[PDB]
Design a binder for this molecule. Structure first.
Ligand SMILES: CCCCCCCCCCCCCCCCCC(=O)OC[C@H](COP(=O)([O-])OCC(O)COP(=O)([O-])OC[C@@H](COC(=O)CCCCCCCCCCCCCCCCC)OC(=O)CCCCCCCCCCCCCCCCC)OC(=O)CCCCCCCCCCCCCCCCC
Ligand SMILES: CCCCCCCCCCCCCCCCC[C@@H](O)O[C@H](CO[C@H](O)CCCCCCCCCCCCCCC)COP(=O)(O)OCC[N+](C)(C)C
Ligand SMILES: CCCCCCCC/C=C\CCCCCCCC(=O)O[C@H](COC(=O)CCCCCCC/C=C/CCCCCCCC)COP(=O)(O)OCCN
Ligand SMILES: NC(=O)C1=CN([C@@H]2O[C@H](COP(=O)(O)OP(=O)(O)OC[C@H]3O[C@@H](n4cnc5c(N)ncnc54)[C@H](OP(=O)(O)O)[C@@H]3O)[C@@H](O)[C@H]2O)C=CC1
Ligand code: SF4
Ligand code: SF4
Ligand code: SF4
Ligand SMILES: [Zn+2]
Lengths: 63, 331, 115, 176, 144, 208, 156, 96
């Protein structure tokens, strides 16, 4: 009723993410810094995961 | 390089490729493929049309918002050509007609219009100009089609020394006359080929291959004053080529020899119609003639494209003509 | 330890026989699928595409992941045999409209900032 | 409390059965429906003669967007970006900088008419009533590009419709 | 009775300036009703009302035949109505701009324009911002 | 509590608390927790193995008899070891009451299909599988119900991008609708709206 | 000469015939369709303009896209467009059909029906009012009036 | 205060004009460029400076609830004039 298999979990083949958005991205795990414009600390309680910044260009129409 | 013309993005619909192309004759058979390939990578295409805009509506979904701009023009005016190519850095010439209309003969279509386009582009500072001429274009050709093609090629090379000349060999495709033209005859019962088509060899080329060749020639920097010959992989006799065309279309094929003079007479009779003719005297004569061979001219392979055999796309083109055994090739 | 609940299989052998069973069904279907959708592809290159899709998931070493991928493949087979998909859905496997993305360092350096 | 819609029992006396048979054979209820339709033909139709006649509207009606200005002639917009923040469809794009006289004014104010849901949240979020959703609705277009408004188009719309916009705001500002 | 409806029809024919005007309005607006003239527009539009009609048909406009630059004998559209008469005609108010005019402002358009889509006067979007990144200009004098 | 404040109803709170204790007593094998919200809503936290029993009890017991399934859905919390939580909302017409049953699962662990207990659950579980990737054991026909044919990934998952990975257009060269990687003309604008200076002291967490 | 006069008159006749009877088939995709059906309601009476109510695709003249176009539906709409006789027009109604609208940044929505089929008239609003849709239809009529086919064939 | 670009386009109030080498002007051929003829900076510059005998003056833009939020402007600095942050109107104490 139990396999009891010992191996690290890997769900990459099930999430549907394209291949070049898996092995090429570099995520960052961090606690966001406090905004020095304010003295409140409620935005520095949790952990955040974010991806690396890619190219952002200007639209030829309307810019 | 005029920063607004610096490529950006990932080469998609909303990217920027740094290409501003004016595609004369974009409403034709090869023009739609050229415009689609230009627009699918983020370039801006200026399209000049003499026809009703309803006929140009099929080019709208080919680019992003504002990336395809339609302008009216006519070949007899140099102001329209100036205003259409004024801001472009690439000019592509695709103006052509297989029959001579009352207002435009082959001198108008293949000589005066291309020369005016090249001269205006040179005066406007266009960096790249691409011209299209037939493979079998020669000054001593019996047909005025290829004679005017050769004269126009000379005059364009004179007006635009840095122009790139492309010489396709009887392009075939989905909205191509050549595959479709042979299939269409079945209506007259028998198929008439001069000398039963045993003394004519052809070198058909896929439409997508020609469009990709034009795109790569635009991209390729050293192909400024060069001249390319776009040909297919396999040469065929006319008879077995028509046999294969009829075999794919599942149409019974009967071939009967017709006198060359007799064939000319039929073309002349056909030439009478106000509407576009099924065939013309120049067309019958042109079809019979075997495609030249110019091994000295750089080919399609020099543009990093593998020519696609006709056997892969014959079903695609000829499935609609219905309600396996490829033809033998000569090399 | 690390005891985990089965989905369909207990070890990689049952997963492999399910994968094999699924693969055979796909192989039988391709000639029929190609004909019915009036596809311009050949049966040979269709089955090569099948081989490529199956090899994409060849590094999996977990019976749960393997038989879940088998379940998804069986769902796809279902959509194709019942003609719920259209020509576009089948041709989305080949990417005939996307330009070829180069792999070498110099080409990637020339095109843009993307590694 | 509840009602029964279909809890009637037809009578089984001879007169009721004969009445139902007469209904079946002579098509009485079909004639009743015909009479209803015939009567309904001889009454005046509800059609109005567009475009010479127009449907009724209200001062609250949300139409095409416009940027207004003060009676002195300077634009009311101060680039606070509250309309951009509240926009449920992200249809507003704003860029601003200090003007040559030091005023706080926009350099870019674009609204995508093809992403707009015409909810009016922008005009009610505006502190100074700079942006309003005017009474115009007959602004259909032949291309997608002309439905991408910039600041000049919106200012022109404001100058074009200011009289009616001000009249509607005068009529409705005591409810806001 | 029938004589009275015929009399009202004849009155409608006579009230449009004769048979010529009757045919004109019949072929331009597909209507032959007569109502009190509420106002005249500076572009040539005429505005009529008739409170005896049901709500929606109690106000109407007869368009001008020549607005800013085009022949509008047949090609009329709803964008030709100026904003004040637009407010009156859509029943957004009970007061025509003749009895009480709108507030006059120096920036308000003095010449109303219709919808100019599919016309060389059409609107073309463009970015209104300035260049963000300025490039370095190499010197014009040789270094060696 | 003057007019702007929502009035309370302690009778319903007491009734729901007593009934939660009752259900907890009858099914100690699966029921892990019972809670009643300040707006009188009863939710029961159970083990995944007890989906079929507990639901059946709540449908068939004379005292409860919740014969109608109002909704079945999933919530994704990536920070938890068991990623997805399954929520069952049930309505009892006999006693005019509502109950909620919560369960947990991860990507690979299946959840027993409750189609036998409620006929309504069949579409709901199909949508849960489509949007979250949770497999349901013994479903009559488990397949995608809302997404396009051949769609890769599950949209409702937190990690999945708002605009997806592929977009559709029409190509004239191949004369058909084709799919390419998404390329937005204008990128969606991300807003950082959360403020410092916490709003609700009653929900403050220990500082660990 | 008379050669241009005759083709001009015939072209005017053909344009009047085509624009005086426009037969639409309507994709009632979403909430925009409800205003569509209010333009056929007695108040506005589309039929009084020669615009028939719910024409069949085999003999329709104008395509009205009224609502959101999802990725799952785009091939069907493209096929229906491909199945239309040549003198055909497409009217994009509402913000969802124009540019994706309020689901523009969605994983399952086509960001404008013009990615699939060419569009002749764009009608703004969410949804655009019945009168606004009528204005758009009338505008399409004027656009058809402006076209000229026999003249172009004569000068070509 | 609409000016004209050296190439020939109208310069907008923002100041954006396509450069001579810019291809993007091709969108304006056979068409026009949307430019608003009323420049707000000049129009607010034409307004006379109000004279008030108060040390602090309030402004709401006129119209009551139809203007901007009411603000208070200090007029102690005799070198310059007090300017409204919303409406742009100018105020001054009666010097001499
Ligand atoms: C029938 C014989 C002809 C007379 C007739 O049809 O009158 C119907 C007229 C019907 O009354 P109604 O239309 O309900 O009343 C509306 C007002 O009269 C509303 O009156 P109105 O101000 O709309 O009248 C405008 C006037 C003028 O209308 C027109 O010029 C356009 C119609 C031309 C018709 C040709 O229309 C007529 O009165 C003549 C109708 C066309 C007769 C042909 O009276 C009758 O003849 C009843 C006949 C018995 C029927 C059973
Ligand atoms: C007997 C032989 C038959 C041979 C085949 C011919 C078939 C019959 C021909 C008769 C058809 C009648 C045509 C009359 C149409 C004119 C209608 C008129 O009202 O149009 C006006 C004028 O518009 C156009 O300019 C009319 C052009 C129509 C053609 C003009 C002359 C064509 C006659 C040539 C016939 C010769 C045939 C030769 C081949 C056999 C404006 O209408 P429109 O703008 O829409 O609606 C605006 C709506 N508003 C008013 C509410 C705002
Ligand atoms: C003393 C010597 C006399 C000799 C004896 C003669 C006595 C005659 C008495 C009987 C005559 C009646 C016969 C008339 C036809 C009756 C047929 C009938 O009743 O069939 C109906 C069906 O009738 C219909 O439904 C037809 C409706 C079709 C729609 C048409 C609308 C009707 C109104 C239109 C006007 C008709 C105009 C008639 C005159 C036309 C002049 C040319 C039964 O169907 P159901 O009620 O569903 O029950 C069947 C399940 N057991
Ligand atoms: N297999 C092939 O077809 C190969 C084609 N040739 C050459 O390739 C070029 C383009 O080929 P293809 O697209 O198939 O030909 P098409 O007939 O399909 O298109 C011709 C284009 O040129 C325009 N055009 C034609 N005449 C005029 C004119 N008098 N004034 C303005 N525009 C005009 C057409 O516009 P409109 O529709 O309004 O008339 C149309 O857009 C041609 O120069 C042809 O000679 C090269 C080898 C063979
Ligand atoms: S009306 Fe609503 S959707 Fe449109 S711009 Fe204003 S806030 Fe945005
Ligand atoms: S809310 Fe009003 S003042 Fe603020 S940016 Fe928007 S339009 Fe300008
Ligand atoms: S455009 Fe607006 S009204 Fe029409 S379907 Fe979309 S959201 Fe609904
Ligand atoms: Zn002020």
């Amino acid at each position: 009723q139990l396999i009891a298999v010992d191996e690290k979990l890997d769900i990459t083949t099930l999430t549907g993410v394209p291949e070049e958005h898996i092995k090429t991205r570099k995520v960052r795990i961090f606690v966001p810094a406090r905004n020095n414009m304010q003295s409140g600390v409620n935005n520095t309680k949790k952990w955040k995961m974010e991806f690396d910044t890619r190219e952002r260009w200007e639209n030829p129409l309307m810019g | 390089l005029h920063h607004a013309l610096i490529p950006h993005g990932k080469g998609g619909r909303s990217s920027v490729s740094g290409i501003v192309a004016t595609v004369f004759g974009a409403t034709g058979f090869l023009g739609r493929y050229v415009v689609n390939h230009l627009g699918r990578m983020g370039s801006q295409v200026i399209v000049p049309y003499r026809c009703e805009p309803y006929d140009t509506m099929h080019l709208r979904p080919m680019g992003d918002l504002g990336q395809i701009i339609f302008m009216e023009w006519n070949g007899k005016d140099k102001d329209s050509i100036r205003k259409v190519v004024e801001h472009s850095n690439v000019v592509i010439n695709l103006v052509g007609r297989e029959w001579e209309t009352k207002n435009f003969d082959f001198e108008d279509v293949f000589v005066k219009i291309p020369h005016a386009i090249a001269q205006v582009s040179k005066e406007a500072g266009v960096e790249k100009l691409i011209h299209i001429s037939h493979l079998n274009a020669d000054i001593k050709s019996p047909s005025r089609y290829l004679r005017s093609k050769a004269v126009g090629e000379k005059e364009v090379r004179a007006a635009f020394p840095e122009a790139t000349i492309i010489k396709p060999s009887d392009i075939f495709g989905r909205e191509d006359r050549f595959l479709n033209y042979f299939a269409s005859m079945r209506w007259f019962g028998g198929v008439p080929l001069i000398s039963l088509g045993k003394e004519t060899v052809k070198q058909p080329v896929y439409i997508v291959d020609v469009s990709k060749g034009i795109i790569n020639a635009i991209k390729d920097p050293d192909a400024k004053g060069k001249t390319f010959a776009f040909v297919g992989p396999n040469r065929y006799l006319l008879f077995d080529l028509v046999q294969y065309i009829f075999a794919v279309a599942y149409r019974p094929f009967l071939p009967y020899p017709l006198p060359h003079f007799a064939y000319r007479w039929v073309g002349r009779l056909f030439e009478v119609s106000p509407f576009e003719p099924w065939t013309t005297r120049d067309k019958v004569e042109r079809v019979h003639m075997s495609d030249m061979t110019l091994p000295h001219l750089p080919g399609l392979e020099d543009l990093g494209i593998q020519a696609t055999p006709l056997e892969l796309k014959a079903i695609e083109v000829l499935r609609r003509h219905r309600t396996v055994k490829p033809a033998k090739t000569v090399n | 330890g690390t005891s985990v609940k089965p989905i369909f299989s207990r070890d990689m052998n049952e997963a492999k026989r399910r994968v094999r069973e699924l693969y055979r069904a796909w192989y039988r279907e391709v000639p029929n699928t190609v004909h019915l959708f009036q596809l311009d592809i050949s049966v040979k290159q269709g089955r090569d595409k099948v081989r490529e899709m199956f090899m994409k998931n060849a590094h999996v070493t977990d019976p749960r992941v393997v038989d879940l991928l088998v379940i998804k493949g069986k769902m796809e087979l279902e959509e194709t045999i019942n003609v719920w998909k259209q020509r576009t859905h089948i041709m989305r496997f080949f990417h005939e409209t996307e330009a070829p993305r180069p792999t070498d360092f110099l080409s990637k350096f020339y095109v843009g900032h993307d590694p | 409390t509840y009602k029964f819609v279909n809890m009637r029992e037809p009578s089984m006396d001879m007169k009721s059965v004969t009445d139902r048979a007469a209904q079946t054979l002579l098509w009485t209820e079909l004639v009743r429906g015909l009479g209803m339709t015939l009567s309904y033909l001889f009454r005046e139709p509800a059609t109005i003669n567009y475009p010479f006649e127009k449907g009724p509207l209200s001062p609250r009606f949300r139409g095409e967007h416009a940027l207004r200005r003060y009676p002195s002639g300077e634009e009311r917009c101060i680039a606070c970006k509250l309309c951009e923040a509240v926009c449920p469809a992200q249809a507003i794009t704003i860029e601003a900088e200090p003007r040559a006289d030091g005023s706080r004014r926009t350099t870019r104010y674009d609204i995508d008419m093809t992403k707009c849901i015409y909810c009016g949240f922008c005009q009610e979020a505006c502190p100074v009533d700079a942006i309003v959703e005017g009474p115009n609705f007959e602004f259909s277009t032949e291309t997608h590009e002309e439905l991408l408004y910039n600041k000049e188009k919106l200012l022109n719309n404001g100058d074009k419709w200011e009289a009616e916009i001000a009249a509607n705001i005068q009529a409705d500002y005591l409810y806001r | 009775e029938l004589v009275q409806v015929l009399r009202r029809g004849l009155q409608q024919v006579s009230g449009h300036g004769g048979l010529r005007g009757y045919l004109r309005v019949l072929f331009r607006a597909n209507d032959v009703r007569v109502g009190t003239l509420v106002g005249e527009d500076k572009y040539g539009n005429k505005y009529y009302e008739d409170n005896k009609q049901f709500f929606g048909r109690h106000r109407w406009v007869i368009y001008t035949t020549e607005m800013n630059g085009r022949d509008t004998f047949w090609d009329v559209d709803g964008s030709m109505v100026p904003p004040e008469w637009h407010r009156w005609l859509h029943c957004m108010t009970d007061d025509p701009p003749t009895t009480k005019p709108p507030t006059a402002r120096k920036y308000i358009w003095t010449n109303h324009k219709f919808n100019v889509s599919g016309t060389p006067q059409q609107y073309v979007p463009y970015s209104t911002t300035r260049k963000k990144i300025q490039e370095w200009v190499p010197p014009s004098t040789p270094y060696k | 509590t003057r007019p702007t404040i929502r009035p309370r109803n302690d009778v319903v709170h007491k009734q729901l608390s007593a009934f939660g204790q009752y259900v907890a007593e009858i099914l100690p094998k699966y029921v892990q927790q019972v809670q009643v919200s300040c707006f009188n809503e009863l939710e029961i936290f159970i083990h995944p193995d007890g989906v079929i029993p507990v639901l059946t009890f709540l449908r068939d017991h004379t005292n409860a008899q919740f014969k109608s399934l109002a909704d079945l859905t999933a919530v994704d919390v990536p920070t938890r070891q068991n990623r997805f939580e399954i929520v069952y909302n049930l309505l009892s017409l006999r006693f005019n009451s509502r109950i909620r049953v919560k369960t947990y699962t991860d990507e690979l662990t299946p959840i027993e299909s409750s189609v036998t207990v409620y006929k309504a659950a069949n579409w709901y579980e199909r949508e849960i599988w489509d949007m979250f990737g949770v497999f349901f054991a013994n479903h009559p026909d488990l397949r995608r119900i809302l997404t396009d044919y051949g769609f890769e990934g599950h949209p409702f998952r937190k990690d999945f991008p708002l605009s997806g990975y592929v977009e559709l257009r029409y190509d004239d060269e191949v004369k058909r609708v084709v799919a390419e990687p998404v390329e937005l003309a204008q990128e969606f604008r991300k807003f950082d709206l959360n403020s410092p200076w916490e709003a609700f002291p009653a929900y403050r967490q220990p500082p660990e | 000469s008379r050669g241009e006069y005759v083709v001009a008159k015939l072209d005017d006749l053909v344009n009047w015939a085509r624009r005086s009877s426009l037969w639409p088939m309507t994709f009632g995709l979403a909430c925009c369709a409800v205003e569509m059906m209010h333009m056929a309601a007695p108040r506005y009476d589309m039929d009084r303009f020669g615009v028939v109510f719910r024409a069949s695709p085999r003999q329709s003249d104008v395509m009205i896209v009224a609502g959101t176009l999802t990725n799952k539906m785009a091939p069907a709409l493209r096929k229906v467009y491909d199945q239309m006789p040549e003198p055909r027009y497409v009217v994009s109604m509402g913000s969802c059909a124009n540019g994706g609208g309020y689901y523009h940044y969605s994983y399952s929505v086509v960001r404008g029906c013009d990615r699939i089929v060419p569009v002749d008239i764009y009608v703004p609003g969410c949804p655009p009012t019945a009168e606004a849709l009528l204005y758009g239809i009338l505008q399409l009529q004027r656009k058809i009036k402006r076209e000229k086919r026999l003249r172009i064939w004569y000068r070509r | 205060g609409v000016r004209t670009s050296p190439t020939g386009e109208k310069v907008t109030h923002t100041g954006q004009a396509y450069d001579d080498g810019d291809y993007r002007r091709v969108r304006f051929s056979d068409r026009q460029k949307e430019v608003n003829e009323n420049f707000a900076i000049d129009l607010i510059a034409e307004q006379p400076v109000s004279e008030v005998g108060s040390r602090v003056i309030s402004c709401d833009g006129g119209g009551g609830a139809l203007g901007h939020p009411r603000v208070y402007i200090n007029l102690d600095k005799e070198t310059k004039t007090g300017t409204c942050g919303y409406c742009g109107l100018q105020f001054r104490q009666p010097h001499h």
